[PDB]
Structures are given as structure tokens and as C-alpha cells.
Ligand binder design. Structure first.
Ligand code: 6FG
Ligand code: 6FG
Lengths: 193, 193
């Protein structure tokens, strides 16, 4: 049921810690979840569909966490308010680096992974632009760039920079410095004249 | 000679306008360059090596243009000095979008394409950090983030945002707004307290 399904998802997330989706067979997932290969196909149509569900859960987990923040404003200054929002992504994706890495690789080959990512990026950018506009309306931020274009560049910077950090790419910001680095660039570009 | 070699490179850059490297065969490049398939193999070991050379030429072209700028400072204010530097990348990669797109796709599968990209990204980030430090030493920019970490995030933002613009990704900044968008974020984050 949701038991064999969860077992399959947990197995795939464990195996993805060690090798790419290419080195993982349906037999590996089935054996890890303690079921046969034809039984696997009753829960998922392919190993690609397993990754899509894992990605969908992590993305939604990030999106729900940001919604919670939105509904429960922290009582602190502006720089800290941005930091707690960026942190949702740093901690949610940073707690699932194997899925994040595999999902990024699948954007190239999977229309559904590309559309899921694109849909949520559009939503986070529109939320970011809405916050910038509210700040501009209250006179706390200057009318500089179009808010939506500024939001789009800053969300793409975060996608790329967090991802480089979590993958240990050359070049990357160390993971223990990446939150501070991004918050500085967001605050200075949103509030700077 | 350099004639048959150039013909092969021009053919591959033309074909890459229309389809991915996967849909292009060695026979396609040979026929386009007016030579046989075994003759092709005398100039390049594979279609992947053709892409690597095209990428190497565009990268070096960008790097030499930035060096020229470095050696011949423009007589203008700071925001314009950053704009002319970012522009080197916007115009060089923007004039070769098919190669840029294919080269980005090959980073996943080619160690040599990944190393070429990584080597030049490290050089541009180190140059960027050196400029920020000079500005800090002369008292024109505040000592906020570590210069090299700030440089790394801004160069990764440019890589990702320019690339999204040139590929017409969803989401992306329109190509006619992307230079202005990036220059704002660089200037406010480098000079903002
Ligand atoms: O940091 C963000 C968004 C940060 C943020 C803060 C408020 O709204 C979005 N992203 C990383 C991957 C995709 C987007
Ligand atoms: O915009 C830049 C660099 C811009 C810049 C200006 C000065 O030094 C680097 N990049 C795009 C792809 C890789 C780096």
C-alpha cells in the first residue's frame, strides 16, 4: 500500500546517495523494497517516475514551508525576514541533496521534471516580486528595476548557487557561507538605490 | 588544412542551430564540410571533440575580450565599468547561442567540457574578486562579504541567468532586459553597505 510505495521511495533515495539514476535498475529498487520486479510496476511505471515523485515531495515540502512563513511573519528586521525565506530552500533541498542532484540531472531528459521545476520557480518568483512590491508600496524599498525581473534573477542565482554548494562544484561558495552570501545580495539589490 | 577544419567547425555550429549534438552524425559533419567520413577522423576524433573545440574558441574569445577591457579601462563611472565587463559575456555567448546551449548540455557527459568551463569560471571569479578588493582598498566599496564568495555568487548568477535568457527558458529575464538586471544586482551588492 502506502507501505510498499514508501519502501520503494526510501530505497531509491538511499541508492541515489551512491550512484546516478542510470546505475540504478528497477530490480535494485524492487529488491531494496522487498518486492518483485512485476510488483514494482504496479506502484510506479518506471524508475524515472520514482524520481519524479521524490522530487515532487521535496518541492512541495519547500513550497509549504514558505507558505507557513508567509502566513506567520517573523518579528525581526528585514534582512532576517529574507534570510528565513531563503533558508527554507537551503534547509529543504540541503536535507535532500541526492534527490536534488538527480532531479537537476533529469531536467534535461524529462519533460515532467522540467515542467514541475518551471511551475514552482514561476510561483516563487511571483511571490518574491509580490514581497518586493509590498516593500516598495510601503516606502521601505526604492523603485529601481521591475520587481519581477529582479525577482527572476535572484531566484535563478539561488537555484544555481545553492546547487553548486550542495554538489561541491568547482567553483562554489562553501555550504556554511552560502546562506549569508545570498542574503547579502538579495538585501542590497532589493533595498539599494 | 585549417580550411577543412574550419569547414567542419562551421558546419557543426550551423547544424547545432537546429538540433542537439545527439541528432547530428559524423556523416552530417563530413557531408557538410565536403569530405568523407574517414577524412573527418583525421581532423577530429569524434563529434564531441568538434563541440569542445567550438566551446574552447567561444570561451577564449570571451576571456580575451575581458582581458582587453582590463588593459584598456573605459573612462566612465563605476556602474558603466561593470556593465562593459558583463557585456563581454552577454555579447560573446549571445552571438553563439547554439554552441553555448550544446556546451551546457555536454557539461553533464564530458569531463573535458566540465573542466574547461570550471577553469575559466575560476579565472573570471578571481578577476572579479580582485576588482572588488581594489575598489575596497581605494575606499570606493565597503568591506561587507568576503570578496571571493561575493564574486563566486554573482558569476554563478550571470552564468545561470544569461543562459536562461538565451535559451528562452521559463522562467527567464527577457534578453533585452538581462544586462540591466545583472548590472543592478552587481552594483548594489558590491557597493551597498
Ligand atoms: O532561494 C530560492 C527562493 C528563495 C525565496 C525566498 C522567498 O521566496 C523564494 N530558490 C532556490 C531554488 C529555487 C528558488
Ligand atoms: O558574466 C559573467 C562574468 C561577468 C564578469 C564581469 C567581470 O568579470 C566577469 N559570466 C557569464 C558566464 C560566466 C561568467
Amino acid at each position: 500500500g502506502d507501505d510498499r510505495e514508501l519502501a520503494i521511495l526510501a530505497t531509491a533515495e538511499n541508492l541515489l546517495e551512491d550512484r546516478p539514476l542510470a546505475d540504478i535498475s528497477v530490480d535494485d529498487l524492487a529488491k531494496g523494497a522487498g518486492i518483485s520486479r512485476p510488483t514494482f510496476y504496479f506502484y510506479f511505471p518506471s524508475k524515472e517516475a520514482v524520481l519524479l515523485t521524490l522530487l515532487d515531495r521535496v518541492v512541495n515540502q519547500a513550497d509549504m514551508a514558505l507558505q507557513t512563513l508567509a502566513e506567520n511573519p517573523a518579528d525581526t528586521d528585514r534582512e532576517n525576514m529574507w534570510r528565513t525565506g531563503i533558508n527554507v530552500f537551503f534547509e529543504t533541498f540541503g536535507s535532500h541533496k541526492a534527490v536534488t542532484r538527480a532531479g537537476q540531472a533529469a531536467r534535461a531528459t524529462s519533460v515532467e521534471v522540467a515542467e514541475l521545476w518551471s511551475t514552482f520557480m514561476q510561483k516563487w518568483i511571483a511571490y518574491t516580486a509580490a514581497v518586493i512590491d509590498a516593500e516598495r508600496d510601503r516606502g521601505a524599498a526604492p523603485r529601481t528595476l521591475p520587481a519581477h525581473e529582479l525577482a527572476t534573477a535572484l531566484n535563478l542565482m539561488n537555484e544555481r548557487t545553492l546547487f553548486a554548494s550542495f554538489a561541491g562544484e568547482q567553483p562554489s561558495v562553501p555550504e556554511a557561507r552560502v546562506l549569508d552570501t545570498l542574503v547579502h545580495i538579495w538585501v542590497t539589490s532589493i533595498y539599494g538605490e
